[PDB]
Amino acid sequence: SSDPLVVAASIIGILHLILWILDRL
Amino acid sequence: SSDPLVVAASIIGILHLILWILDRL
Amino acid sequence: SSDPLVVAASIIGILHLILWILDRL
Amino acid sequence: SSDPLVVAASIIGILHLILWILDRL
Ligand SMILES: N[C@]12C[C@H]3C[C@H](C[C@H](C3)C1)C2
Ligand SMILES: [Cl-]
């Protein structure tokens, strides 16, 4: 288990890489 | 719970995405 | 122990830096 | 506590933002 803020940052991180990849594809 | 280092990096990761969006718009 | 979604985001974050370094060079 | 893979990704995430700022400034 993890802190809700860490879970929130994990969702944000995944979206970050997706947008970063799409911004180049 | 999460380690303090993980909580700190979570805040930093959120900041990182916010900065990337603002810098992309 | 960490939430599985946090472990997934950790793997994705590590990949993110690898790709980021490769794309800048 | 947090998984070592999460701790590693936290260190790497912090380093990632540092490099992003330096390259931005
Ligand atoms: N990039 C991340 C660092 C830390 C571990 C994992 C989830 C959160 C917090 C964002 C990847
Ligand atoms: Cl955790």
UniProtKB/TrEMBL annotation, chains A, B, C, D:
This is Matrix protein 2. It comes from Influenza A virus (strain A/Udorn/1972 H3N2). The chain holds residues 22 to 46 of 96 of the full protein. Forms a proton-selective ion channel that is necessary for the efficient release of the viral genome during virus entry. It is found in: Virion membrane; Host apical cell membrane. The chain crosses the membrane at residues 4-22. It comes from the Viruses. Homotetramer; composed of two disulfide-linked dimers held together by non-covalent interactions. May interact with matrix protein 1. Belongs to the influenza viruses matrix protein M2 family. Cytoplasmic tail plays an important role in virion assembly and morphogenesis.
